[PDB]
């Protein structure tokens, strides 16, 4: 059979999507698995982009997303893949690196463009009001990229000002409690419980 362009794109998507769920099933602790996972997601979105370019509305029953959605998700996938490829050349390569450790949701969480492990909870009460309380996470370990492109591991520090980590000699705040107060209470008073 001579494959229609939709049939070819369909065949490739079905294999990619099967592989993606294999990853979910396996729950590998290997950083190299996560790198591969994010490659699959880039490829998935590249297929959906090409599908739309070819006037295809649905592919293997999947609704072909808007160009902006395919592009956004691919860019996100590349970003994560290259961060993981760098992290894989660090001393921390052989730690456990799971789907959960390397998902977009966590990546987008402060501090962003960093990996983090071991969240310890921080409770902040605004205006002495106990029932007006925001929960934050002080990460046991933050992995950040240096200017040289290598990944280093450091701990979080708590203070009245906020949550920070030391990035190549520079205190780097990822939560500012003043900014959070000026948004949940507005008296200039807050209490930090850690």
């Amino acid at each position: 059979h001579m494959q229609t362009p939709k049939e070819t794109l369909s065949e490739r998507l079905s294999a990619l999507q099967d592989k993606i769920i294999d990853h979910y099933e396996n729950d590998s602790k290997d950083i190299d698995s996560q790198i591969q996972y994010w490659q699959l997601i880039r490829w998935e979105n590249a297929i959906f982009f090409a599908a739309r370019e070819h006037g295809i509305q649905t592919l293997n029953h999947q609704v072909v997303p808007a160009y902006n959605i395919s592009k956004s998700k691919a860019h996100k996938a590349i970003e994560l893949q290259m961060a993981l490829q760098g992290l894989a050349q660090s001393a921390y390569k052989t730690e456990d690196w799971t789907l959960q450790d390397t998902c977009e949701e966590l990546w987008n969480t402060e501090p962003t463009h960093c990996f983090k492990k071991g969240g310890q909870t921080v409770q902040v009460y605004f205006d002495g009001n106990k029932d007006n309380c925001m929960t934050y996470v002080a990460w046991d370990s933050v992995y950040y990229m240096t200017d040289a492109g290598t990944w280093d591991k450091t701990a979080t520090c708590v203070s009245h000002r906020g949550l920070y980590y030391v990035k190549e000699g520079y205190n780097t705040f990822y939560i500012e409690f003043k900014s959070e107060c000026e948004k949940y209470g507005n008296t200039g008073t807050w209490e930090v419980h850690f």
């Binding site: 999507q17 993606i20 769920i21 979910y24 099933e25 729950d27 029953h61 999947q62 609704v63 997303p65 959605i69 789907l99 959960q100 998902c103 977009e104 949701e105």
Partner: protein, 201 residues
């Protein structure tokens, strides 16, 4: 029931036939543009009854099959369906007194207004009263709706204490009119068997 969530689900899986497949569930989520890891994180907090994470919401048109998907979970876990009556009283919450998980199907604008005012303790994981005034711990509540409760800021208390998954796409059928994805007890059994530890059960 008295048993914890882990014991209950393990027991429910005991009563369900072997041979299901978790894949249609995962595939249906990704079909609806939902990230697997995000959903699983939300479900973990939901089953624990975590404060501010005790209500899960599936939002979209009836043709998405959000209610079929949601109800399949309820059937699996043997949860209870509650029927909303606009009141200032909690009397209509009777069916959830003794359940593991409750479901309210097709929450209206009026329902969300009710939740924003009258379901605060439930949203926070604090006991509520139904009636001699008896206190009761509210089980996790799954809601389906086509009124997004956290887009337009109408419900400020509710807004920060619910998790919403949107279902943008119509429930898919193949060329013979057969559903592309079937979601039933056996598929949910496999789903839990595959995600047990990740759900912290």
């Amino acid at each position: 029931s008295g048993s914890n969530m882990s014991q209950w689900i393990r027991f429910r899986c005991s009563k369900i036939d072997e041979g299901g497949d978790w894949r249609p569930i995962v595939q249906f989520l990704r079909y609806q543009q939902i990230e697997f890891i995000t959903f699983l994180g939300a479900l973990k907090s939901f089953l624990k009854g975590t404060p501010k994470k005790n209500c899960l919401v599936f939002c979209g048109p009836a043709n998405t099959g959000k209610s079929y998907f949601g109800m399949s979970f309820i059937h699996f876990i043997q949860g209870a369906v509650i029927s909303f009556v606009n009141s200032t009283s909690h009397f209509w919450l009777e069916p959830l007194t003794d359940t593991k998980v409750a479901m309210l199907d097709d929450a209206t604008t009026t329902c969300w207004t009710y939740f924003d005012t009258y379901m605060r303790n439930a949203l926070d994981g604090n006991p509520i009263s139904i009636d001699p005034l008896i206190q009761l711990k509210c089980p996790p509540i799954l809601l389906t709706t086509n009124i997004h409760p956290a887009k337009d800021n109408r419900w400020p208390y509710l807004e920060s204490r619910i998790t919403v998954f949107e279902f943008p796409n119509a429930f898919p059928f193949d060329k013979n009119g057969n559903p592309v994805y079937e979601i039933n007890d056996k598929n949910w059994k496999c789903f839990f068997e595959r995600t047990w530890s990740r759900l912290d059960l």
